[PDB]
Amino acid sequence: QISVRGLAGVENVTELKKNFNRHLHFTLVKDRNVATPRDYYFALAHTVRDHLVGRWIRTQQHYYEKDPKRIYYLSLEFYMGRTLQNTMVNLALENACDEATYQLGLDMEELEEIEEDAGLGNGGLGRLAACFLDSMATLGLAAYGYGIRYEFGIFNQKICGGWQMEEADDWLRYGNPWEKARPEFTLPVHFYGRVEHTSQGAKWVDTQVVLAMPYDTPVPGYRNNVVNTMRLWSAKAPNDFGYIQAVLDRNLAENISRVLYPNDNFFEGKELRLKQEYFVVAATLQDIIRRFKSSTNFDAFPDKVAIQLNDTHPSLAIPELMRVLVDLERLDWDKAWEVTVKTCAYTNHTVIPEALERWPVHLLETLLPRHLQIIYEINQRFLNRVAAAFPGDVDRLRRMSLVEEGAVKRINMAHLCIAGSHAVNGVARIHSEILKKTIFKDFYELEPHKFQNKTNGITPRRWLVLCNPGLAEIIAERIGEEYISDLDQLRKLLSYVDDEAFIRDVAKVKQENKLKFAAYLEREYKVHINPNSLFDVQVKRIHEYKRQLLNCLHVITLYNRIKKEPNKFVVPRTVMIGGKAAPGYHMAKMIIKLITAIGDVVNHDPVVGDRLRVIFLENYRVSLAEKVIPAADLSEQISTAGTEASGTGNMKFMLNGALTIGTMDGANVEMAEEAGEENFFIFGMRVEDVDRLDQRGYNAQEYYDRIPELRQIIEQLSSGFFSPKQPDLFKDIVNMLMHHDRFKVFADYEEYVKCQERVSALYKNPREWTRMVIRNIATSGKFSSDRTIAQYAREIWGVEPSRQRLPAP
Amino acid sequence: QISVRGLAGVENVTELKKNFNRHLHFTLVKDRNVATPRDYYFALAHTVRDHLVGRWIRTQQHYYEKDPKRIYYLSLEFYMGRTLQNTMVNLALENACDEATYQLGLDMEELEEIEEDAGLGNGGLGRLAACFLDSMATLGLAAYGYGIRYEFGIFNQKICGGWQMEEADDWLRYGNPWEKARPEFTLPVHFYGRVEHTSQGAKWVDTQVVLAMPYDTPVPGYRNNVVNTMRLWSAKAPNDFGYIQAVLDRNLAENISRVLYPNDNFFEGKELRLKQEYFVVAATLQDIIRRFKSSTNFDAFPDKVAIQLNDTHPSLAIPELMRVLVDLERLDWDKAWEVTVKTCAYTNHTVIPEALERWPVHLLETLLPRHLQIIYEINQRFLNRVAAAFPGDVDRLRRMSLVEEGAVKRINMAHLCIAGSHAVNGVARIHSEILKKTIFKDFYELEPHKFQNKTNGITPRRWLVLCNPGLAEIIAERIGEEYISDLDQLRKLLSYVDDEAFIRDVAKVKQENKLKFAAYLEREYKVHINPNSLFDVQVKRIHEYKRQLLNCLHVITLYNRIKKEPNKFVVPRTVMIGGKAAPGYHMAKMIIKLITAIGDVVNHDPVVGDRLRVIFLENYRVSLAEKVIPAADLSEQISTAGTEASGTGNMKFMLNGALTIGTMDGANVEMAEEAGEENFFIFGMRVEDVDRLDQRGYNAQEYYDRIPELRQIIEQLSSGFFSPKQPDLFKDIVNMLMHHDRFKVFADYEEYVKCQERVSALYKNPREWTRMVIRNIATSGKFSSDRTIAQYAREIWGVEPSRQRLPAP
Ligand SMILES: O=C(N[C@@H]1O[C@H](CO)[C@@H](O)[C@H](O)[C@H]1O)C(F)(F)F
Ligand SMILES: O=C(N[C@@H]1O[C@H](CO)[C@@H](O)[C@H](O)[C@H]1O)C(F)(F)F
Ligand SMILES: *Cc1c(COP(=O)(O)O)cnc(C)c1O
Ligand SMILES: *Cc1c(COP(=O)(O)O)cnc(C)c1O
């Protein structure tokens, strides 16, 4: 029972125990004789949920009364993770429930492990949406998250024979106690059809109809009694439509919300994905307009509504809003456009070419004929403005067009978003600058005022208090609990950098987390890691730009050095790498095989002993991140400079006591700036260096010829040293590294290895390592999503955040 | 507030109101400001459900302790209807909830109309299963109903342009508060594959797996605190099985429990239907064996288990039980067969050839290879016994074989059921006799001891107390409430046949029900019936053997007679016909069109006035039956003698104050016997007369030539009198009646019309009509399903029914 977990008052504990038994009986229809751990988990979940409803109802009633400006965050992904503990934390019910369940003879931690992750996201983009919802509630904003209720989220990853196997994430199998179906608010969504031009306006007719049924999930703010809503739409066929066959084919319409596309930073132009994108936008906008008409001059629309587009996925919101205002409300084009631009804002999350959405015209033409017409009109009017500002610059006109010519005509959704939004932002200072100097340079020159920066952040509730109570406690002991909702206060810890007691406590918490994780590794998965070794961790989606391959080269280097001088001392390390590969990404799947293949050799070499271990963490997800991050010593953030827009895992590691080894990419730059470069392990090419190399031409052979250790590794891979039975198993990997590596792994190899040596040197000095850690934790305040959201609120949405408690429950 | 509805004590009402508000708040997450009638319905449903759980848990605990013989009723259909009122009735909570909701400013009757019917059945067979579950709980039997949870039940019928239109019955859209998902008890079901013969036994391998997830619904007995279980299986794909496509194809496995085949007395040999049949049998038997091993000598299996097969739909239970005992438990064939025969019993529900299941061998061969082998072995051993009992009778061998030769080999499932069951029963005395003299004559000669009769019945709770409180009340006033669970006591009403007060009350209740229904007809559907007319009703599924066409001929006759002598007095009538037609049954759909077509002419003829009205009751279902039956004066039960196995609607009408006009078919024979033929309107050919006609040869032309009035009707139909714009619209109907009428409508026409004249004559004498009604109600006791179930229990299952209250809640 620790401080930050709240009070366990003898009135609340008694009440919780009583309600727990009531739900077990009436809700689950069970008794203590046949109840299983899962039944107990649900009884607790319903009990905690009850405390949420009263606050949920009055929060919504409050917004109705005060009628503030509403913020609508549109996203195709919300990576929520588990909800039980987070709810207890935000309601200050953790110790009380811990005590209550204890008295009932149950271990609450065991029950929490039963909850399924709500994996409605792929990684960074989806988790950001989740942290944002938490911060918006904590800052008292009338915010609504709108998305899709996929019945199958990100697939569960299994490793067989060292290869990734995918299996359906049937997360709703045992039910979801957090959501509340609202079938009464079902809305129709139209597809296909054709456009008819009548006396007064165009009409979209002969369409196929799919119903959108909403499910609401509560989003509690941190101890302020505010509970916002996340509304997720589910596809339903109308009862309108051989009898048997007709009923069975209903599943054709309902497939829209069936599964999440498992791609991270990769565009797949499939019809089903386009349907999902329009589905969420169409249902959401009707809901927004309906709520507004209760709040008909749409001139005040922008004063009461703000729509934030999470990348281009919900970009159809722009032409859909125009369609409704022009075709249905009958506003003149110019007025409708003014309203649209003023309510929409766009956030770009990547500059990688293969990740940008460019939809084939023939697809939109067939699926959304009216929207295509509106997009052409928008393009026509936009290009007229470009032509007026840059007379005779024809090359500029074709570069800025929303319509892309070539093999097949495509619509550049990013161009559409910029043209129809009053603000466009990047997610890290360096990323936002790259947008203005390269990808969106032409647009920045036309409308400089639209471009902004909003550096990403993470919520300190889930990423500190929830996953690392031990650290939150020792910090609270010295500076109070105020920092949990005002992370900048962590700076006060700077005056404890020479405090012998604090140094000891910080190191003790880390050691306990490592023992806790090392245990979990054996209990689940039966591994064999040594808690005394340096925990070197790289967890994130598998992708070539992330460079898990560079990490692999270092691991093999360490192994070869040990085999060369067996009785020479080296700082023991446990290298952990985890992450999922998109099912259709061949190279990513081969990288996973390589990692397990290296472990097969290294982990069973008698000469290596327990000085080096290579472990691939299976099924990396939010719940696993909450376990491994607090236990890490070294955070690997090694993407090629200019490719990771921001990164967020990097922030989680910094807040939890791990030092960082990384490139000057994304938010790493601002992190190093806040902590001081001397307290960061920076290495490799800077963005400018990468450009110079491309000017000259990247030739990997050069590095291979001049670096003996590197040559040895490539020869081991090519000869079958890591794949005896299949000598050429890794031929594709070697071929790519040698002839077509877009991310120049070899170019940063030497500096990476040398930087890693400096990390080992510091680890040998426990006291100085811990002092540097304190320097990092103390300056991580800027990376709280509360800061990020406060900036979006003031600089983009035009609303003031608030910390005032809502009038109790 | 009437007597039979229970007490409304000031302690219970206060408690109900408090729990009602709690559910509205915590469960529905609403407040009195945004709540709609549907929200109030759910708040009440959850409140009533709560009172059911405590009794549900202890009932199951009781069975576990005493370990009585268990009864398993297997059926592919359970036509439950609505559950709220039935639950209140059985728990004696109706007046209390009426008062509680009244104090909350709500009308409970309005809320009850919001509940969706659980239409998991087609008609008679499915409703019988439902009445049986009610009676088994009321008689204290450890019974379990096992079936399939179709996500789409019997389709909702819409009438457009006088034609039937079908629309999906999405009954689970707003959720089902009565069921409790039990995902923890999920079981695997195998399909396809092949058979491998090993050293010790055969093995069924390389199968496709589909999971069966159970949902439990409580079944409360009448005021005895017993709550049994109805377990319905739902199909789930294993998470085992392009990534996207693979996930979308999961719906291929889950289609098994998607929709109920909408056929009544018609066999459709489709693969999907076969999968549904094995699915329910496979999951159920594993559940049964699992529960048994807790209760390994299977010799005691028949002493602890009874499996009742509702027709041949679950017939695969026989070979599946053999498969498990022989292949899995490793019992010798002879021992396994002894156990199987002793635990299984089969109930036949029809003699109509097109309704009997005869599955093509090639289907079983591909879908269930091991079962086909077992069926061949059973057939081989069975025929060996036949050959030994009737040496040299080769014709007998081919007639009795389970394998039917011909175009395509088929398995006669009825033969399989008789061979593998220790008891076979018909559902009405005349039907059971027909089985022994015709269809199953050979089997009866071989094993006479197996054949029995169990005349159908209906539950007096739903079919009297629930739907006709007014009548239940006036009856209770004179003889007490004991008859509700001992219907034979209604005989005491015979001593009131000359009681002027009772006569007046019986007639008053009927008039009130008629006004109540006449109102509903306008409020919903905007009709124009006259409450003073005789309510002539025929409601049941549309089928040629039911002869809705004969009724049509009478209606047209009445119309023509009025047009012939306009100013002659005739007893006013409101003829109501309702029922659904199977989607693929052309003739049935044409009959519906004919009925609406007749109404279009008759209802708008100025000369007819309000002396005759023809109304087609749309979407006939259980909830509608509860409204129209209590309001009927005349019950039409006119199937051709020997075609309606029993009928159950006939019993509902008799118990509710309507007189019956019908043929000596099914249970009509026993009803007339109980009430006295003088108190019934019997007409037409008897079974023997139908046979004589077939011997001679049925020639409809003869009747057409000798009956002028009949000739006129056929000429009106043929000339387009009832279809001006489409003169030959009813050509198919006329052609069938004249050249290929298997049910000889013309043969009973004259006697039918004359009998109808006798009905009108009696109606003109209110006092004598009511006295005959009292004679019917008073002798309807034999038709209580409590009597039927008591007989199944004692003569087939070997268990004693009980009326003892269970040790409170
Ligand atoms: O997932 C995408 N972008 C991702 O967004 C997150 C959140 O801003 C960033 O931290 C990360 O660097 C970036 O790759 C996308 F969609 F752009 F490909
Ligand atoms: O539905 C069928 N049979 C029906 O069963 C009910 C219930 O016993 C009888 O009352 C009815 O007469 C009969 O047609 C079936 F399945 F046999 F076609
Ligand atoms: C935070 C998080 C991410 C993002 O990690 P990066 O290293 O920024 O790519 C991805 N997946 C999960 C489950 C996360 O919690
Ligand atoms: C009782 C009932 C039936 C059976 O009626 P019969 O006239 O015996 O065919 C059919 N449908 C419903 C909804 C019923 O309640």
UniProtKB/Swiss-Prot annotation, chains A, B:
AMP binds at D31, Y64, R290, R291, F292, K293, S294, S295. Allosteric enzyme that catalyzes the rate-limiting step in glycogen catabolism, the phosphorolytic cleavage of glycogen to produce glucose-1-phosphate, and plays a central role in maintaining cellular and organismal glucose homeostasis. The modification Phosphotyrosine is found at Y192, Y215, Y444. It holds the Pfam family Phosphorylase. The gene is PYGM. It catalyses: [(1->4)-alpha-D-glucosyl](n) + phosphate = [(1->4)-alpha-D-glucosyl](n-1) + alpha-D-glucose 1-phosphate. The lineage of its organism: Eukaryota, Metazoa, Chordata, Craniata, Vertebrata. This is Glycogen phosphorylase, muscle form. GO terms for cellular component: skeletal muscle myofibril. PANTHER family: GLYCOGEN PHOSPHORYLASE, GLYCOGEN PHOSPHORYLASE, MUSCLE FORM.
